[PDB]
RNA sequence: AAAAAAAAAAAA
């Protein structure tokens, strides 16, 4: 429940800029597994 | 007891609250003239005909 | 290996490099060390090695503060920890 | 011991002047207003600020007629010519520009200042402009040929002020080295040096009808008599860095203090008939309270001040004031007054 | 009948994409700049198809951006002579 | 049974298609005009119509259509608590 | 977040070289130009 | 043109170069540097006019270092507060830091408007502008939190 | 026809910016055989 | 994204999934954001990355 | 004019503390960490 | 002598012709009278002196109090808190 | 004047107390930092000495 | 009704 610092940078499209977040790779692996699992289970259960 | 959002928060009083009731406060951020209109108008001739000054 | 458990020698070299360099220069501090990244040195400073961290047994009033703040802010430990006065991991533990 | 005068006529009794009150505050400038110039027909005035624009404002309405760009640093000087349709700007970018008011365009450059330029005066009868800056030099320029016809050297600090008058001493340069120099314009030589001020001389002014002038540094204003520079009197009680000074045709000295302070003095007697403190535009810091430039209009009825909260303040004298409502609190004190 | 066009914000998006291509780190090598142009042009046309062919401003933007890419290639050779760079210099496949 | 015929949310942009009978449209415009009165019609300035389409295509902008579009915007803006989110007229295009 | 690891009587060579490099870098003050100027002043005095 | 140019050439050939003593203009590549010079001088001038007569006026560039520190604290959204600093000196520092901040934000806005318009092809200017708006957005985000 | 071309003297008037004005209403004009640009040049004050 | 309450978001995610995953997501949104020498804690709004 | 009379109160009231820079060490000084955090105002924040 | 290399440019000064003001002096009492008359005219000009479908929605009347923006324009002397900067940052950072 | 200079250098040549500096000018600057910042930073020094609470 | 040097390749 406590995580590392997330780096913040700006990506420039020359009309707007947007935040880009840099997450620790081990937490990125956990988040990617959670993201895929959540999307698949919400597709199975007709959430959207 | 009302809710003040972040985007309509006032951190400072108004101009009338600071300067008083007898002070006229102006916020001027656009010009009344174009840049092509002179501040001092040049003395303009506007000759529309050819006329001899002295009698020939 | 980049990472690993922190030793006392690494901790003291981290403190000495913080003394000589400051807190806004972590690449030099990591360059004194060998197995730790600038981010890992910064995390070690911000979570353990800062001596503005209260490192003794908690007082009771700290415990009611922690329990009330964990009641009003579920799982926002990075928000609870400045108000209690400890770190996020200390408050969570 | 040097003898004094015991006649009790050495102290003039002050004339009554009404107090001054705030009338207007004009926003729109995005920098500290440091220049101000009323045109000779009293219709519009010219403000130069730290946002490197020069704004032309109608004097009666306070309504923004025009904005002129072309400087790249803070505008420090401004002068509307009474004999030519020209305006004269100087800046912190070493540039001295001559604007043709019939085209609203810069038509001349007066190049040669090695640093930022702080002052700029038009000679009342001759076709000459005078600049001073951080290089310790008063440049005297011919208008027509843009030629630097005099280099007035001798100051060891930033030349912060300067006045041009029609008689000798034709140039008066106050500097941050605490000295005031009186210059003959024909030769380019120092007629005199005044070293009475202890700190950097930031303000100068000349009287419209008397052949006297005034200098001002922090905590001290001194009135002097031309052409010999004899010390006339002290204006005392304004304990602040004094940036400006404005005497009226009705004998009013206006000292504006960098901490936001104001003093209105009677010119002949040295009596302070008003002591104010300006107020900051909302959003400003306490440190942004400061009168940075000031002038009177040609009528003398309005005081225009440009202030470090980026504002323009107009001040009128109080029409509902009488000598009974605001009595003069001056008495002929009998003090040695250690000089 | 739904008449389709490409919005002005997206024409400006493509223009900004070409400007970002021209400001990139490897934008001085001719093959790299050509590959980046090819990727951007393929993305634009394969997304916007028949709506793209019916927008005059988008076609003008494509012409100007292709001219800018070729001008970058020419500036890399210290010339801008049109006879010095025939269409065979740019549009010949990478195999030849 | 309901005026809202079509609805789509693409992440954070919404498109809503409404169909109004004349009574429903009159009631909505009446409620909008009695909530935010405007007796001199400053509503033509600020309303949206695409300049990219030709002269004939951008056909007319009368009283009823502009007030109906602003009424739809006002009614849909009244359903969103502004502490959560809202919809701004600058980020909005309405066609009638 | 864990407190520390206690030392050993027999230190490994990595702690020795890390401590030596920390001592060497903890006392460096000058740049290349100041060091070059000091060396050139010494060489100039020797030549004179 | 060519006769003026060759006259200048023969003048450099036969009476030398007047390299030192002329005023260089403030071109674009100098603007920020020039700003710093002027600002420092202004701050320094105010310090000499706030010192009472008799104070030790040698270590007053220490105030210019304090001004640099305050500007660095403004750019990082760190509250700058030196314990024991005199109030008029702190006021001078805050006043000139806010003037520098106003200039910095105005330059950032101008460069962003040039980048959106497509009027800039400089890469370092664009990266500078991205950094400046990154700092401004993080200041706004900290204030929002 | 056959003459030189220059930059626009006045880059201001453009029909896209001007909205549906009453004076130049599209179908209040009684179109006939079209006016050519040489007629606009020959009588510049009537046709411009 | 800017105006998302993390407690309300935790409640709604607790509605739709297991409470461990909801708590993980809500704690993962509450992190420290750093850029060079600038740093703060995200306690209000959403981390879109 | 004759010099203003300076008390010890004024001489201590116009004492400027040395700048404890937390970004720059041009002379490579090893500053105590106590002095490094004195000008940091984050320690003067009320968490309410 | 001098060391400048200006080519001749703008070699005649313009003078204020009749109708351009400037070199025509009046008394300062007349200037005060004209100033007060013009100021009074401007101030007098300022004062003017010569099934129901929306029933199941959860939240209602949430947009009330939004059109009240623009009662008077407030200049704020804090650049990071002015409306111009907030519009700038909402436009350019998404 | 020479005697006072020699006595000041001799009294500055003593290593009494905790060492933090690396050079002589560093030592003098740290002594100056002490002479100004003890009355504001003694609490932080206490926190550093204890290894616990702020 | 038809638009073509420098940075930048370093003080016996």
PDB file of C-alpha atoms in Angstrom, chain L residues 36-84:
ATOM      1  CA  UNK L  36     -11.465  70.094 -14.665  1.00  0.00           C
ATOM      2  CA  UNK L  37     -13.965  70.723 -17.485  1.00  0.00           C
ATOM      3  CA  UNK L  38     -12.814  67.639 -19.416  1.00  0.00           C
ATOM      4  CA  UNK L  39     -12.732  65.523 -16.242  1.00  0.00           C
ATOM      5  CA  UNK L  40     -16.244  66.662 -15.305  1.00  0.00           C
ATOM      6  CA  UNK L  41     -17.472  65.885 -18.831  1.00  0.00           C
ATOM      7  CA  UNK L  42     -15.997  62.370 -18.709  1.00  0.00           C
ATOM      8  CA  UNK L  43     -17.386  61.685 -15.223  1.00  0.00           C
ATOM      9  CA  UNK L  44     -20.815  63.001 -16.259  1.00  0.00           C
ATOM     10  CA  UNK L  45     -20.689  60.686 -19.278  1.00  0.00           C
ATOM     11  CA  UNK L  46     -19.859  57.820 -16.900  1.00  0.00           C
ATOM     12  CA  UNK L  47     -22.772  58.628 -14.578  1.00  0.00           C
ATOM     13  CA  UNK L  48     -24.968  59.449 -17.588  1.00  0.00           C
ATOM     14  CA  UNK L  49     -25.634  63.060 -16.583  1.00  0.00           C
ATOM     15  CA  UNK L  50     -25.789  65.373 -19.653  1.00  0.00           C
ATOM     16  CA  UNK L  51     -43.771  12.029 -18.489  1.00  0.00           C
ATOM     17  CA  UNK L  52     -41.329  14.844 -17.773  1.00  0.00           C
ATOM     18  CA  UNK L  53     -37.973  13.717 -19.123  1.00  0.00           C
ATOM     19  CA  UNK L  54     -35.622  15.364 -16.598  1.00  0.00           C
ATOM     20  CA  UNK L  55     -37.141  13.839 -13.465  1.00  0.00           C
ATOM     21  CA  UNK L  56     -34.856  10.826 -12.891  1.00  0.00           C
ATOM     22  CA  UNK L  57     -31.651  12.893 -13.035  1.00  0.00           C
ATOM     23  CA  UNK L  58     -29.774  12.712  -9.743  1.00  0.00           C
ATOM     24  CA  UNK L  59     -28.453  16.288  -9.646  1.00  0.00           C
ATOM     25  CA  UNK L  60     -30.496  19.364 -10.565  1.00  0.00           C
ATOM     26  CA  UNK L  61     -29.678  23.080 -10.933  1.00  0.00           C
ATOM     27  CA  UNK L  62     -25.929  22.487 -10.639  1.00  0.00           C
ATOM     28  CA  UNK L  63     -25.095  25.135 -13.273  1.00  0.00           C
ATOM     29  CA  UNK L  64     -26.756  27.994 -11.375  1.00  0.00           C
ATOM     30  CA  UNK L  65     -24.228  30.653 -10.422  1.00  0.00           C
ATOM     31  CA  UNK L  66     -21.951  30.100 -13.443  1.00  0.00           C
ATOM     32  CA  UNK L  67     -23.041  32.963 -15.730  1.00  0.00           C
ATOM     33  CA  UNK L  68     -22.153  35.475 -12.972  1.00  0.00           C
ATOM     34  CA  UNK L  69     -18.566  35.691 -14.265  1.00  0.00           C
ATOM     35  CA  UNK L  70     -17.720  39.183 -15.481  1.00  0.00           C
ATOM     36  CA  UNK L  71     -19.487  41.515 -13.059  1.00  0.00           C
ATOM     37  CA  UNK L  72     -16.284  43.578 -13.018  1.00  0.00           C
ATOM     38  CA  UNK L  73     -12.832  42.781 -14.350  1.00  0.00           C
ATOM     39  CA  UNK L  74     -10.368  42.290 -11.491  1.00  0.00           C
ATOM     40  CA  UNK L  75      -6.693  42.865 -12.179  1.00  0.00           C
ATOM     41  CA  UNK L  76      -4.657  40.720  -9.780  1.00  0.00           C
ATOM     42  CA  UNK L  77      -1.026  41.698  -9.189  1.00  0.00           C
ATOM     43  CA  UNK L  78       0.086  38.072  -8.867  1.00  0.00           C
ATOM     44  CA  UNK L  79       0.907  36.590 -12.259  1.00  0.00           C
ATOM     45  CA  UNK L  80       0.571  32.934 -11.207  1.00  0.00           C
ATOM     46  CA  UNK L  81      -2.939  33.611  -9.844  1.00  0.00           C
ATOM     47  CA  UNK L  82      -4.390  35.850 -12.571  1.00  0.00           C
ATOM     48  CA  UNK L  83      -7.099  34.713 -14.978  1.00  0.00           C
ATOM     49  CA  UNK L  84      -4.706  35.091 -17.930  1.00  0.00           C
TER      50      UNK L  84
END
